[PDB]
Each structure stands twice: as C-alpha cells, then as structure tokens.
Design an enzyme around this catalytic site. Structure first.
Site, PDB file in Angstrom:
ATOM      1  CB  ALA B  94      -1.463  -4.930   3.022  1.00 52.93           C
ATOM      2  NE  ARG B 103      12.958   6.360   1.587  1.00 52.45           N
ATOM      3  CZ  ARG B 103      11.998   6.972   2.282  1.00 52.45           C
ATOM      4  NH1 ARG B 103      10.734   6.574   2.182  1.00 52.45           N
ATOM      5  NH2 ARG B 103      12.306   7.983   3.089  1.00 52.45           N
ATOM      6  CB  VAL B 106       5.200  -1.322   1.441  1.00 52.15           C
ATOM      7  CG1 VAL B 106       4.101  -2.224   1.942  1.00 52.15           C
ATOM      8  CG2 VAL B 106       6.269  -1.122   2.517  1.00 52.15           C
ATOM      9  CD1 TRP B 227       0.625   2.890  -0.460  1.00 53.27           C
ATOM     10  CD2 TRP B 227      -0.473   0.976  -0.115  1.00 53.27           C
ATOM     11  NE1 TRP B 227       1.544   1.941  -0.117  1.00 53.27           N
ATOM     12  CE2 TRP B 227       0.898   0.754   0.107  1.00 53.27           C
ATOM     13  CE3 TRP B 227      -1.368  -0.088   0.049  1.00 53.27           C
ATOM     14  CZ2 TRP B 227       1.401  -0.492   0.476  1.00 53.27           C
ATOM     15  CZ3 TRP B 227      -0.874  -1.320   0.419  1.00 53.27           C
ATOM     16  CH2 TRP B 227       0.502  -1.514   0.625  1.00 53.27           C
ATOM     17  CG  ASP B 294     -15.068  -7.144   4.234  1.00 53.38           C
ATOM     18  OD1 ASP B 294     -14.118  -6.407   3.931  1.00 53.38           O
ATOM     19  OD2 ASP B 294     -16.164  -7.107   3.657  1.00 53.38           O
TER      20      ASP B 294
END
Lengths: 217, 432, 236
Positions: B94, B103, B106, B227, B294
């Site tokens: 992402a 703004r 996310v 995050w 990955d």
C-alpha cells in the site's frame, strides 16, 4: 481467399525464418571454430585459468557441492565442440564437451572425459525439444566412494538413500545425467550443460578478466 | 449470489473520505486462476488441496486529475477435499506518491478497502475459473490456444476462412465449450480467513521515484510497521471474532522488544510469533507461504538454489532472512498475520460498479502498469497516470473512471452516523 | 619459472586473447550482416502478405505489452491507424553504418477531421562518443509529422511560449506522445521524448521483426488466453 492466401504466405514466411536462424547459427559456429582453437591454445599457457574461472562463476557454484571444488580446481582444459558442425543431423544446440582433470595424486585420477548433449524431440511439449545425454564413464575421487554409486552397498538403507543422493548431486553425478530419469539424477543437469555451452566456455576469458578485476579490489 | 446487495465499494470509500470532496477510484480485478498451492506441500502430508484459486485486486485513488494512492491485494481460496476450505488475503503493498493536495486518512482508506474485500463471498471467485491447464486434445475442431505456434495459428485461420468465410468459431460460445473450459467450485460463505503482510520500507515502490518528491513523507521500518498495525488492529476489532489469532514478529528482534510494540494494540489477543503451522519439524519450506514479490518467498527460492531447503527451520529462517543483505529488512521490518472468522458472513458478489475485470492478464497488466510504471519524481507523473487511466478505460473498455463524493467529518453529530444511515434505510425500505 | 619469463608468457597470451576477442567482435558483425541480407527478400515477401491484411498493425501494436508504456494511452487512437511499417537496415546500403542502424517508415491512414493521412520516415544511427567505448548510442534527427488536431494544445508548433510556466507544462505533455517521439534526437537529454532510443530498438528488434508472432497471439479463441504462450520440486 485473398485474405487466406496471405495467412498461408506468412506462415510459410515464419518458417523460412526458422530455417534462416539455423543457417546463420551454423555460419557463426564455423567462423568461431578456428578462433576458439587459437584462443584455447592461449588459454592453455595460463595454468590456473579454469581454476580461477570456475570459482568466480556465481551460478556454476550453485550446481555443485562445496566439497566438489577440491576436484574442480584440477580442471585444466575444457573444449566444447558443436556437433551440428560435424553433421547436419544435429541441432545447432548440440555439442560434446571434454574436460581434462589433473587429478589429485593418491585420491583423484588424472583423466579426460567427454560428454555429449543432444536435443530430443517431444510430442508438442518440446519447446524446441529438450537436452539429453548418456552416462559417460568417469573415475570418482577415492574419498567420494562413500557416495560413489558404482561403489555403494544398498540404496534402501536409510544411510544408503542419503549417500546416493549426495553423490548424484556432485559434479560426478552430473556425468551420468541423461535428462530422461526425472527426480533420479543430478538436479538441473541440462541447465549446467547449457551454462557451459552458452556462458562459461564462450566467455571464459571475460570471466577471467572480471575475476582479476575482482582480486585487485 | 444473484440477489440484491446493499453495501458497495462506492459506499465503503465515501464513508471514509472527506465530506463534499470528489475522488475517482479504480478497482481492478484479475480473472480468478487455478494455481499451485500457497505453501509448498509435503510429499506425505495430512491433507492435499482439491484446488487453489488466485485473484488479484488492485486499487487506485485519484483526486483532481492526479493519482495519489494504491493498494495491491491478492486473495487466495484454498479448497480441500476433506478438510473444508479457507481464504487468505495477502496484502502485497500500500503506497502513496504524495501528490494529493487535500488531507485524507490513508489509514482509513486502506482499512476500508480491506473490509470491503473481507465482505466478499468466497464463492464469487469460484463461479468461473481459468484452469491452470486446458486440454484441447478432446475438442474438435482445432482451436487457437496459448500453445499454438504462429505458423499453426495462421494455417488454422486460413482453413477457417476457406471453409466458413470467417475466422471465428460460433462453437466457443456454446454451452458444451464454456463448461469444459472453466472450472467451478462451491464452499461455505463463513470460512476461516487469514491475512498476511510483510512490512519493509524497500517494498514501498508502487510509485517509483516518489521519494524524490519532497511532498511525500517516507516511513521508516518502525513507523511503517506501526502504520500497518493500527490498520490490522482495527480490522480485528471491527471484523473478526474476539477469539481471532493475531501475530506480529520482527525478524532478528527479540520478542520482548516485539512485545513492547503490541502494547498499543486495542485488540486483546495480539501475540509475538506468526500464524504459520509447525509441519515437518518446523522446516521452513513446508510452512512458509510463497507470495508475489514477497521477501519470504524470495529467500525460500534462494534456499532451493543452495539446496538448503532441508537445512533451515522456521526459527532459523527469520534470523537468516534478516542477516542477508539482499532481502533488506534492515530498518526493523516485520511480519503480521491474522487467522479467524469474520463477524458477518460474507455475502457480496462485487458488481460492475465494484470492479473492472480486464479481458486477459495482458490487459490487466497494461492498465496497472500505467500507474506502477509511471515516474513520480515530479507531479507530472501523477497526472500522466490519471490521464492514461481515464483515457485507456474509455478507449478500450468503453468505461469512464468512477467518481464519488466523500461524506465524513469531525462528528459533532446528533446521533451516531451508523444509527443515522440505518434510519434512512428503514424509511425508504419500509416505506411508511 | 623465472618470475620474469612467467610474467612474460602471460602477457604474450593475454595479448593473444585480446587479439582473439577482436576476431569474435568482427565475427559478430559479419554474422549480423549475414543475417540481415538473407532476411531482406524474406521481409519483402512477408510485408506484401501483411498489406493484404487489414488491421494487422493496429492489432500487433495492441498486442505488444511494453510499447504501450512508451506512449500516451490516448495515442492509440492514432496508433490504430497505422497500416504500414517498413524497417530498412542501413548497413546493407553501406558498410559505414552500424548494423544497428536503420530507417523506419510509417503510414498512417488518418482520421476524418482529426488526423491527416501521411507517411513519415525517421532514421536512427549509432554515434560513438569521444573517450567513451560504449559501443555508442542511437540517435536521430527530427522528422516532420502533422499532429492530430486534438493535440493542438500540446503541439509544439502550436504552443505560444515554451518558456512560460504553463507553456512548458504543455510542451512536456506533448513530448510524451508518439508525435513527440518523431522529434526525438537523443542529443538533448531530459528535454525530449523519454527513452526514444528504447522505443526505436523496440521497433527494430521486436515489433517489426516479430510482428507476426504478436499478431497470432491476438487470435486465440479464448479472450483470457490472448496473448500468452504456454514453486518447487524439493527432492532429488
């Protein structure tokens, strides 16, 4: 019909080109023969040329056990010969390859060994075909007879199934690789072969240079 | 199935976006493919998969003629003959490019796209499946398939023309052919669901050179991990049953450190470790899932190359993965996994409004590459991406880029917005 | 065995080896020229069938995956009108050209009220840079092409001030269309069509040579199979 005529024309064209690939590949192979001989003669005045060139190749090292290098270091000639030059009945990708080992006095016998690789055709799964060989005799290191297949007591043993495996994964096991016994032979024997025919032998010099460029640093 | 649905992708998104602001979105999906098993199988193992179905979802958002966010998720449905069935959402990446002027959250966008993907009925992917291998040896007349040489392809075209006056077979569209050329399966709607994710700052490359752009704040391994944690945390809270397994691990880091990070999680059952099994005496090969791009899989393939697959355990694997410079991780990269059942039974079969499914892999890639292959050192790439996306859709897919207006705000509201939208439903549905 | 004789036999061999790579190099060219000449008549035969087929180029250029990357998606309106691509290799006319040298000719059918029907030819020669044994780079000079009317706002010949802030934005936008590429020369880095050189080679090495391959992949009977050609085993 003016539209179908054209599809056929192109199909015949597509095949003229196949024919031209081979004809060009031969042309190149013949121009390279003398130059390989000259070059190989010079290679031969450098006495650790192949030793160096084989420790420095990334992929090659991957195909063989660390233990094998004891013996790889004894290689002092490698000649590839493109069999399509000897006869129009071979694929331009066909070749024989000859190694000379200096042997290790008291363990490994000095010897010259040739192995040939030819494409075989399939029944639509060909992808040009596949590379195959037949077992060629080589004399194993005296050490390796613990895992020499011609010299092992029994495959079924739990010990026995482990040694045969380890032996088939050596450079020597590659010598009996045929590409017709899947999951029973040296892994990616055909890839190591092509490695020699397409990468190592044709550019060994360039690799020897890079190897020296890398020693200085 | 063929019955109405109420929640749509448009809805999830608007709910999370700034009120009265326009955003375009692109929801792109691959044709579900029959593929190899996720985890390398054990030659002698508990249970073998009847089948394994892979679908990619790619998302992008644009604001005012500029792309600014993307999300790449692969969904895998694994069918066992005896052992039921489960779905696994692998969150690949992402990213942002930092060219959104207003703004937005996310974290919330990403959360909500995942909730949407969670709300998808698994059977949706099983309806019509590209096989891994189609056998044309049973079919007459001769077809032009992936393996036809150009010369044979052309000779077939020629034969068809001389005989038909056309190069098309009416036969392809017939019932006999369509059933033999695709696979169908069924499974329960409420099935075990896993989520997988690997945080590594070096993976964040949906927008090449977006680093060069001053406007984008580039996260470090630690910031980046947190995050995501926040987001997975919320998913657990909002979407899974409170007995769901939640794992975090930071390779080469000691668990007490790891445990210090799980301190923040609102969700109760986060644990240090991972959601992977312990088969063949914790040998990594047989427990590590191999995903696109990955790091995990990359390493496994290096093991395979150095014939060390039989020499590395799971414990060992994490530490070796961290030690090898070629995989990165350096700035405290992590692995998160979820395993469990969602609260709601996923009923949803995405509509034409929820997804675009390009006609082939080539077409899918072409569209996606308009975004991932653009350069974002300057703003002009965020424009180029949007322009090429909007233009390509209209030109090749006769489709316009979908629009939507956000409807979210700092809630001073009279009543909870979830209990507010429900009233509107009640009146319009129960029409007083 | 003297450190000196030893060091001298090697220099003599190294010299022999360099001399030998030179021969290899000359042979490569020899082989390439060989190849090019045997192909000339065959390309002619083929391209004549190709003209008997309408939409050939439109389809091919839609089959090729990377090509799409070099250009604006909106350029496909115009790419779709291409009905002729001839590549000519310039070394065959004169040994003074690199074997990588060629002129390429396009024909656009045109679009009613938007895009004029036209034939454009563009040449690409390798130049070698001083002090740089890079084999050299591909370069060209600009070729006149009449932009579509829809691109009036990003047509360099139509924009008022390249310098102004707005004018510069628009010029860079036209520069990444296929028409901007006709102006690419390779000698003004960062001010031209990006990777004009990569695109040119694309044409000369893949699109023009292998066009029939790309066309056949667009003819698979199943949509999801157009256009392709068709994990581990850990034991041993």
């Amino acid at each position: 019909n003016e539209h179908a005529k054209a599809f056929l024309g192109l199909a015949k064209c597509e095949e003229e080109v196949d024919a031209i690939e081979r004809e060009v590949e031969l042309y190149r192979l013949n121009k390279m023969k003398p130059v390989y001989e000259k070059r190989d003669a010079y290679i031969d005045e450098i006495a650790e040329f192949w030793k160096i060139v084989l420790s420095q190749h990334v992929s090659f090292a991957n195909y063989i056990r660390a233990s094998d290098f004891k013996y790889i270091d004894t290689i002092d000639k490698i000649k590839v010969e493109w069999l399509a030059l000897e006869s129009e009945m071979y694929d331009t990708r066909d070749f024989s390859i000859t190694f000379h080992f200096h042997g290790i006095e008291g363990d490994f016998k000095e010897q010259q060994v040739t192995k040939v690789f030819q494409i075989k055709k399939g029944k639509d799964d060909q992808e040009d075909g596949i590379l195959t060989s037949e077992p060629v005799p080589i004399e194993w290191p005296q050490s390796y007879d613990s895992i020499n297949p011609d010299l092992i007591k029994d495959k079924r043993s739990p010990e026995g199934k482990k040694k045969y495996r380890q032996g088939m994964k050596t450079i020597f096991g590659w010598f009996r690789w045929t590409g017709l016994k899947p999951g029973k032979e040296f892994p990616h024997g055909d890839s190591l072969a092509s490695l020699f025919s397409e990468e190592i032998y044709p550019f060994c010099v360039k690799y020897y240079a890079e190897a020296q460029r890398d020693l200085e640093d | 199935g063929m019955d109405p649905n109420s929640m749509s992708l448009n809805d999830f998104l608007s709910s999370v976006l700034p009120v009265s602001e326009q955003f375009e979105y692109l929801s792109l999906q691959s044709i579900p493919l029959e593929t190899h098993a996720v985890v390398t199988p054990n030659k002698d193992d508990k249970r073998v998969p009847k089948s394994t179905i892979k679908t990619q979802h790619f998302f992008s958002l644009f604001h005012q003629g500029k792309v600014f966010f993307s999300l790449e998720v692969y969904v895998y449905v694994t069918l066992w003959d005896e052992a039921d069935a489960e779905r696994l959402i692998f969150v690949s990446k992402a990213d942002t490019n930092g060219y959104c002027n207003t703004r937005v959250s996310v974290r919330d966008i990403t959360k909500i796209i995942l909730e949407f993907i969670l709300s998808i009925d698994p059977n949706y992917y099983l309806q019509k499946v590209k096989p891994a291998i189609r056998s044309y040896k049973k079919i007459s007349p001769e077809l032009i398939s992936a393996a036809s040489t150009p010369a044979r392809t052309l000779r077939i075209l020629a034969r068809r023309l001389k005989q038909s006056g056309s190069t098309v077979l009416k036969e392809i569209e017939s019932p006999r052919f369509q059933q033999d050329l695709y696979l169908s399966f069924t499974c329960p709607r409420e099935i075990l669901t896993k989520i997988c994710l690997f945080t590594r700052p070096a993976s964040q490359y949906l927008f090449p050179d977006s680093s060069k752009n001053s406007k984008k704040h580039i996260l470090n391994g630690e910031e980046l991990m947190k995050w995501w944690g926040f987001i997975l945390d919320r998913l657990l809270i909002e979407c899974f049953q409170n007995d769901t397994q939640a794992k975090l691990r930071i390779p080469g880091e000691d668990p007490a450190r790891v445990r210090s990070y799980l301190r923040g999680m609102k969700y109760p059952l986060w644990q240090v470790g991972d959601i992977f099994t312990s088969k063949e005496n914790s040998l990594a090969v047989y427990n590590i899932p191999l995903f696109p791009d990955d790091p995990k899989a990359r390493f496994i393939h290096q093991l395979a190359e150095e014939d060390r697959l039989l020499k590395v355990s799971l414990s060992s694997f994490w530490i070796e993965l961290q030690e090898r410079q070629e995989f990165k991780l350096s700035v405290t990269s992590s692995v998160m996994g979820i395993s469990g059942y969602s609260l709601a039974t996923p009923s949803l079969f995405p509509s034409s409004a929820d997804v675009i499914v390009p006609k082939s892999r080539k077409q899918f890639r072409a569209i996606k590459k308009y975004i991932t292959g653009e350069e974002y050192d300057t703003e002009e790439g965020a424009i180029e991406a949007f322009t090429n996306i909007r233009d390509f859709l209209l030109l090749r897919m006769a489709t316009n880029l979908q629009s939507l207006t956000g409807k979210r705000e700092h809630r001073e509201r009279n009543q909870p917005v979830p209990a507010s939208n429900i009233n509107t439903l009640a009146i319009t549905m129960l029409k007083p």
